[PDB]
């Protein structure tokens, strides 16, 4: 038994040596030449009010106009962000929703939480009302995140330390991803949707192959719980947000940390992260009630989206990069531009 | 300046707002109780008296209570305990027959109670503490002493003194005596006690709002 353990230690040492060999340069040095982004000024274009409790998740539709927000008052609300009109108000079977998703086709929304179930809702019914299409049971812990691949495939992360890929038609988990030793808190599909990455409470992020069903890479830079994870638009990198108050940019090909975004007087955790369309801005939500905008290539804050009276729990950028939505525990979403 | 279909959409949005407000008003009248405790503390019997979270809905003397049994969540409690910030009170269950049981087992119960009571999300949330299996405690204490769990204990082996000692040992874990009250109870009497404690909490919150407290 101990021979396996020492072989594992040797493999970790070899991996570290290879990563160090590939660390000849630092992203900061290479980016020192380019001009920094100015003071990124954004103001609340819209304030989406109507939730009567903490908002825990929000997601944009691929049309960049409709968004769904989940709150623990037991409601999913589909908003028309241009007009602030409530397109739908879906009453949930369990009010402890901690995640929500919008199908890329716009036909379905998903949500889950402490019920350990991911419920898919059919928006495009002929009866004119939204009804639950499928209930995805099989996780033993709370549902932390869920993201559609197609109208029929959804991958979910759970607090039981496993991620699962589901066939919505049958309701069975086609694949189960294991290897995290802590609760999986976030999840992010690659732009091609052939790979996805997940952050866990073990302070490590793991890259998975959707079709092969096994972990390709593991990243362990963070010093604490990872609360959020987002894929860089190119699909060759991803950023993580942790309770240790720092973001960290990892690159799949270089297989190691590239940059860490932190400041001395910001000490709270990070509830969500996201990128702008180019990838120059890395917008992160914090428990100190405001979101910070980071110059992804230069590590320095470019702005602050203050204006929430409580923790900024969720954060998203439209597919066309035209706006940013930030939900909060004060029960208001705000569109910033 | 809106078209006909835009005006109809705005009317739909207003109807949705009205229904949301009605739902929120209805929800406000609900008393939300978080049920916690050790695995074998007797939470099941307490629930009876009234794969993830289990919500129990009961009505007692015109108050509709929602009690959420979250014991099935084996995941990390630190990541979702904030969901229950705002519950009227926490019901905590411990078994008075866990001095010599091990998992020590009462020491685990006190550890969990210390974690829950001094959590930053429950600074002002009142706690209703149920001390279960008092009959089994009465039987067991005659044979095994309380010194096994509390070496510093120096009182008699009678049921009353030992029960009081355990009650104060639990209540002294409260580091914020001023802003939080612990309503200890030895387990229809249970439902009546829950109702009384909840009514007291609600009235004290209202008086705080009105400046009378």
């Amino acid at each position, epitope marked *: 038994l101990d021979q396996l353990r020492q072989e594992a230690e040797q493999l970790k040492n070899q991996i570290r040596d290879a990563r160090k060999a590939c660390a000849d340069a630092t992203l900061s040095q290479i980016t020192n030449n380019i001009d920094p982004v100015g003071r990124i000024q954004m103001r609340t274009r819209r304030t989406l009010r109507g939730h009567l409790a903490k908002i825990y998740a929000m997601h944009w539709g691929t049309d960049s*106009r*409709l968004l769904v927000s989940a709150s623990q008052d037991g409601k999913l609300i589909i908003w*028309d962000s241009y*007009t602030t*009109n409530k*397109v*739908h108000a879906i009453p949930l079977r369990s009010s402890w929703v901690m995640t929500c998703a919008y199908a890329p086709s716009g036909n379905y929304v998903a949500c889950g939480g402490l019920d350990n179930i991911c419920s898919i809702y059919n928006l*495009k019914t*002929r*009866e*004119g*009302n939204v009804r639950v299409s499928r209930e995805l049971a099989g996780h033993t812990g709370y549902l932390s995140c869920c993201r559609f691949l197609d109208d029929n495939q959804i991958v979910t992360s759970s607090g039981d330390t496993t991620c699962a890929l589901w066939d919505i038609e049958t309701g069975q988990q086609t694949t189960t991803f294991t290897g995290h030793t802590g609760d999986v808190m976030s999840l992010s599909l690659a732009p091609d949707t052939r790979l996805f990455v997940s952050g866990a409470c073990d302070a490590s992020a793991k890259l998975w192959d959707v079709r092969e069903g096994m972990c390709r890479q593991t990243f362990t830079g963070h010093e604490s719980d990872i609360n959020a994870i987002c894929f860089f638009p190119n699909g060759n990198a991803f950023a993580t947000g942790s309770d240790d108050a720092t973001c960290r940019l990892f690159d799949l090909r270089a297989d190691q940390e590239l940059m860490t975004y932190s400041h001395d007087n910001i000490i709270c955790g990070i509830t969500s992260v996201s990128f702008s369309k180019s990838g120059r801005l890395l917008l992160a939500g914090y428990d100190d009630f405001n979101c910070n905008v980071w110059d992804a290539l230069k590590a320095d804050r470019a702005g602050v989206l203050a204006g929430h009276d409580n923790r900024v729990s969720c954060l998203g950028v439209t597919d066309d990069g035209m706006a940013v939505a930030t939900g909060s525990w004060d029960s208001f979403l705000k569109i910033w531009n | *300046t809106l*078209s*006909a*279909e*835009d*005006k*109809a*959409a705005v*009317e*739909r949005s207003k*109807m949705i707002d009205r229904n949301l407000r009605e739902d929120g008003e209805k929800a406000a009248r609900e008393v939300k109780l978080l049920l916690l405790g050790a695995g074998e503390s007797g939470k099941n019997t307490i629930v009876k008296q009234m794969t993830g979270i289990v919500e129990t809905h009961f009505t007692f003397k015109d108050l509709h209570f929602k009690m959420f049994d979250v014991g099935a969540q084996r995941s990390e409690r630190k990541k979702w305990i904030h969901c229950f910030e705002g519950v009227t009170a926490i019901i905590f269950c411990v078994a008075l027959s866990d001095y010599d049981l091990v998992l020590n087992r009462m020491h685990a119960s006190m550890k969990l109670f210390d974690s829950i009571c001094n959590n930053k999300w429950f600074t002002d949330t009142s706690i209703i503490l149920f001390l279960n299996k008092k009959d089994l405690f009465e039987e067991k204490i005659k044979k095994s002493p309380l010194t096994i769990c509390y070496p510093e204990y120096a009182g008699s082996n009678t049921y009353e003194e030992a029960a009081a000692y355990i009650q104060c040992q639990f209540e002294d874990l409260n580091k914020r005596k001023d802003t939080k009250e612990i309503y200890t109870h030895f387990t229809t009497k249970n439902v009546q006690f829950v109702f009384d404690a909840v009514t007291d909490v609600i009235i004290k919150n209202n008086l705080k709002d009105c400046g009378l407290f």
Partner: single-chain antibody
């Protein structure tokens, strides 16, 4: 989804009659309801509208005051009290559901219609071609035109296309001049420039023959075209 109307039959001029439609198979409470009538030898003509929740009601000037539209959401029934009936009111009355939100399809489902017999600033929509000879397998196009431009500042061209086959209620083909309705074959396609619009059918089947009605939803007096007929 079924809308079944009743209350037709002979009525002496100046009398009163109540039309009713029974709604089943859909959330009647969340749909706006329209009444549309069709004279035995004329095209469609909007009559009245009642919004979801009965918060808004509109009538055509020809029936305003005389008629009144009401709905019973718990009973899923829609009513139309017609008083002071006149010979001009002889027509088959349809009940049409319409739900209004971003991306919805108003006028998606029509009822089977009830026949009423009376004993003996509006936008104008023009369908110049009354009839067209057509055979299956070919390609056909139907033109349309309006007095006002139907393109709104929000980017929506509020034009609707309906097909009424012999002995059948109109079926929504296109809504807002480009969006194909659910269940319609892809061979149908709509387009327009804001004031002139066209509907095209490719490799049309033998079941595609009928009268094609154009409708505008930009303003309250909703108005239909004369209708273009395709005959085998």
């Amino acid at each position: 989804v079924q809308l079944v109307e009743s209350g037709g039959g002979l009525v002496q001029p100046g009398g009163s009659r109540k039309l009713s439609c029974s709604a089943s198979g859909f959330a009647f409470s969340s749909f706006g309801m329209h009444w549309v009538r069709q004279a035995p030898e004329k095209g469609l003509e909007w009559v009245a509208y009642i919004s979801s929740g009965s918060g808004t009601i509109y009538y055509a000037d020809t029936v305003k005051g005389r008629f009144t539209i009401s709905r019973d959401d718990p009973k899923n029934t829609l009513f139309l009290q017609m008083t002071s009936l006149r010979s001009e009111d002889t027509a088959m009355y349809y009940c049409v559901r319409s739900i209004y939100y971003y991306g919805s399809s108003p006028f998606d489902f029509w009822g089977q219609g009830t026949t009423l017999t009376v004993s003996s600033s509006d936008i104008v929509m023009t369908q110049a071609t009354s009839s067209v000879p057509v055979t299956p397998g070919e390609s056909v196009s139907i033109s349309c035109r309006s007095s006002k431009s139907l393109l709104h500042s929000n980017g929506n061209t509020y034009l609707y296309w309906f097909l009424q086959r012999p002995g059948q209620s109109p079926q929504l083909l296109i809504y807002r001049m480009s969006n194909l309705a659910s269940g319609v074959p892809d061979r149908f396609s709509g387009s327009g420039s804001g004031t002139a619009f066209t509907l095209t059918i490719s490799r049309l089947e033998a079941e595609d023959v009928g009268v094609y009605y154009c409708m505008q939803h930009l303003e309250y007096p909703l108005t239909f075209g004369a209708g273009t007929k395709l005959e085998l």
